[PDB]
Amino acid sequence: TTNHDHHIYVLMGVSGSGKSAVASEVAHQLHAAFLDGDFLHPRRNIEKMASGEPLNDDDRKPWLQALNDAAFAMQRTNKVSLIVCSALKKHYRDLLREGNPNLSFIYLKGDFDVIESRLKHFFKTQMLVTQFETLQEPGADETDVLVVDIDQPLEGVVASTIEVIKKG
Amino acid sequence: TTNHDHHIYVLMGVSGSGKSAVASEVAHQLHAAFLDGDFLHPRRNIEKMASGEPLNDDDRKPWLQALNDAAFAMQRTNKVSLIVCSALKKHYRDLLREGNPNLSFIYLKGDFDVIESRLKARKGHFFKTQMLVTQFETLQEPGADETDVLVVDIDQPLEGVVASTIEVIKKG
Ligand SMILES: O=C(O)[C@H](O)[C@@H](O)[C@H](O)[C@H](O)COP(=O)(O)O
Ligand SMILES: O=C(O)[C@H](O)[C@@H](O)[C@H](O)[C@H](O)COP(=O)(O)O
Ligand SMILES: [Mg+2]
C-alpha cells in the first residue's frame, strides 16, 4: 500500500531541460531513489525510436504504466523518490497519478528561447520546437506541480529542486 | 540495436550485500546510468510481498523481462550502465543475458558473518537471520563456466567496495 509519508517526485519538462542531470545530482544529495524513466520503454519503443520515427500515444501507454508501477514500487521503501519523465501532456500526467496520491511533479521550466541558449555534435532547432508544440503546461488545476527555473546553471537548478522539495 | 561499445553491469548478490548503495555510488562517480531493479516489479508483485510472502519463480518472470528490457534501453544511450539485481539463480542471469550480449555481472560476495556485521552497522537495525540464510539457501554462485561474471569483495568498508567495482569495471 501507499506510504503517505514517502513521496514520489516526477521531473517533467521537454527534452533538453536537463531533467536527468538535475535529478541525478538532486538525488545523490538527498539519498533519494532515482529512476530515469526512459529506461522503462518496451522493446519495440526502443527500436522504433532508433528507426528515426517518434512514438505515438499507444506506444506511450505501456511506458506510462511502467512508470506508474515504478512509482508504486519506489515509495514502498524510499522517503523521497525521483522519476524522470518529460510528461508533456495532462493525460500522461494523470496516467501517472492514478494510484499514487503521494506523487507530485517538478517542472523544470523555461520559455523556448531560454532553453535553446542553455544547451550550448550539435543543437537541433526543430527537435526543441517539436517539444514545445507537444507540451501542455500544467494549468492551475494541476496543483501537485511545483515549478523550477532552468535559466540558471546546474548547481542552482539543483539547489532549487531541493528547496522546492524541502519547501513542501 | 545493440551498441557493443556500450555495456551493462549487473550487480548481483544476496539481499543485504549493499548493491544499491554501491551501485548508486559507483554510478555517480562515473557518470553512468543506474537502475535499481527492485523498482521494476509489477504492481501485484509488490502487493504480494506486501503481505508477508515471497514470490515464486513464476512471479519473477515479468520482473526479469523488464530488467532485460531496461538493460536493452539503457545501452542505447549510455557507455556504461549499472543494474541492480540479486540474480541468485543462473536462469535469472540467463534471462538477463538473453538478447543483451553487452551485459555482465559484478557479484559482490561475502559470507554470512560479513553481511550480518555490515547490516548491523546501521544503528538499531534488526538483523533478520532466517531472511539471510534463505538468501544463501537460494543463491547459486556463478561457477567458472559463467565467465561474464567479475567479483568484488564486500569485506571492506563502503569506500573500497566502491573503489573495487570501479577497478573491476575499468580493468575490462
Ligand atoms: O535538442 C537536442 O539536441 C536534445 O534535446 C539533446 O539535449 C539530447 O537529446 C539530450 O541529451 C537528451 O534529451 P532528454 O534526456 O532531456 O530527453
Ligand atoms: O537482513 C536484513 O535486515 C535485510 O537484508 C535489510 O538489509 C534490508 O531489507 C535491506 O537494507 C534491503 O536491501 P536489498 O536491496 O539488498 O534487498
Ligand atoms: Mg538494495
Side-chain angles (χ1 to χ4, degrees), chain A residues 1 25 28 33-35 38-43 46-47 50 68-70 72-74 76-78 98-100, chain B residues 1 25 28 33-35 38-43 46-47 50 68-70 72-74 76-78 98-100:
Chain A
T1 61
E25 173 74 10
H28 179 251
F34 168 42
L35 179 96
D38 283 359
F39 306 158
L40 304 209
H41 279 107
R43 188 59 85 103
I46 300 287
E47 295 289 14
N68 185 302
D69 290 351
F72 188 67
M74 293 171 85
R76 242 313 273 350
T77 50
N78 302 270
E98 192 169 62
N100 309 296
Chain B
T1 60
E25 186 70 6
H28 185 251
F34 162 44
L35 173 89
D38 265 2
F39 299 160
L40 313 195
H41 272 99
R43 194 52 93 115
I46 304 303
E47 301 257 45
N68 188 304
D69 281 6
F72 187 67
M74 288 164 90
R76 243 311 274 347
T77 55
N78 300 273
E98 197 149 66
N100 287 302

Side-chain angles (χ1 to χ4, degrees), chain A residues 127-148:
Chain A
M127 176 149 165
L128 187 59
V129 181
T130 304
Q131 283 298 271
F132 278 81
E133 306 180 345
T134 297
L135 169 66
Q136 267 162 31
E137 295 211 79
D141 48 312
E142 282 183 84
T143 59
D144 47 17
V145 174
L146 303 203
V147 181
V148 166

Side-chain angles (χ1 to χ4, degrees), chain A residues 13-21 36 38 84 86 115 119 121-129 131, chain B residues 77:
Chain A
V14 297
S15 208
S17 55
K19 298 179 288 339
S20 298
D36 192 321
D38 283 359
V84 174
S86 62
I115 294 159
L119 285 165
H121 190 276
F122 222 52
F123 165 73
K124 297 154 161 326
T125 292
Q126 192 73 46
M127 176 149 165
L128 187 59
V129 181
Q131 283 298 271
Chain B
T77 55

